[PDB]
């Protein structure tokens, strides 16, 4: 987005200044070009002069203003995609009750009881369980008062900026390219789930190419479904965006909310409103208060779904900004936030599409970082999606999600204290698809030290999962 | 053939 104002205040919001990823026994074996992101300005690994405070907000390079004709085109694309979405999902989009928004419904996980509560609560030393009854699905007076302000369209909030404690390529770490999480107030998440939670549940339950969304998928089971679909198209592309969430422009976010979340599709009128509160935001980082126009905060309850919807509309808009006769059947795609696979039997020129995405504020490049840029003839076995390749398994004849061994090494090389055993079981479920030899190599630093699931047990499990 | 240019 466009930073329109920066100011200092006495109230100090203590941002992330720690590192909860300890190196494991595996670090010394694999020596990964990956490490924890820098969480303190006094981190020796960063380059001299690197000031994360500057770097971490450099993503806010502006808010692209769109022309009348381009906005009218975007509106048509948003309405055409919305028509497709709602035809699949239905229009039972009435608000969830407070209980259902807290506890979840089929296709929507319950709210987290002990994650960050956001502002102003973070100042007051209050936890989420002190504001909401996650067992009974009720709210206290504080939240109830805010919900009434939201009903009245009178609610205002600040985003709380957290630095993301995660493993990153050591190059990004050296450059201070630490990611931020914008933690919204828990009552804003709550009301958003009230306004659009049934829609989100339906999105999850209907994930697939038809709606262009993989949010809610299970890669172990669904890679077969997605792979067989994309295998039958002549051209497949995997596209990278630069700072996709920060570069969603005000015009595009407002129009998308207006066309997707209409009352004529069953939504309460405040569905559009609460989503629109995401466009112009205020972010709290220590004594800094930074006001931004445009861009999506990461901590909306529906950030992934909203990013996915925008991705779908961006592709239709860009193709239509360059070709005549483009329709939702001219191509197929599936997206997860900024992640995207597009396919088509037409020789679409993604190189030529670069300026049309730029008119939206977005910069697309091939995911292969090729020097020629986009090309034709790539297949589903060439692309990466959710960090996973699409590989045929020969015992079953089914597609399986295969992660890069370098990435698995990095994941296994760090862990927070007292979770190594738990993490190994988790990562084992990702690594089984790399085959027995690599699976063995990946886990050999932990032999005699922790329980390692047998390759056989996880393969037999996966087989029943993908067919049974 | 493929789609059209405007």
Author numbering:
A (entry chain A): 1 to 468
B (entry chain B): 4 to 9
Excerpt from the publication:
The enzyme adopts the canonical closed right-hand polymerase fold, consisting of fingers, palm, and thumb subdomains that encircles seven conserved structural motifs (A to G), playing critical roles in rNTP substrate recognition, template/primer binding and catalysis. Unlike other picornaviruses, the animal pathogen foot-and-mouth disease virus (FMDV), encodes three non-identical copies of the 3B (3B1, 3B2, and 3B3) that could be specialized in different functions within the replication complex.
Different crystals were of complexes: 3DpolHis-3B1, 3DpolHis-3B3 or 3DpolStop-3B1, 3DpolStop-3B3 that belonged to the space group P3221. While in orthorhombic crystals the bound 3B1 peptide connected the two 3Dpol molecules of the asymmetric unit, in the P3221 space group, the proximity of a neighbour 3Dpol molecule in the crystal packing prevented the correct binding of the whole 3B peptide, and only a few residues could be positioned in the electron density maps. As expected, the visible part of the FMDV 3B3 peptide in the trigonal crystals bound to the same 3Dpol cavity at the base palm, close to residues from Y323 to V326 and from Y346 to L348. This binding cavity was also equivalent to the so-called “contact II region” in enterovirus 71 (EV71) 3Dpol, involving residues: from T313 to I317 and from Y335 to P338 that anchor the second half of the EV71 3B peptide, amino acids from L11 to R17. The proximity of a neighbouring 3Dpol molecule (Grey) in the crystal packing probably limits the 3B molecule from being arranged in an ordered way. In light of these data we suggest that 3B2 and 3B3 could bind 3Dpol through region I which has a lower affinity.
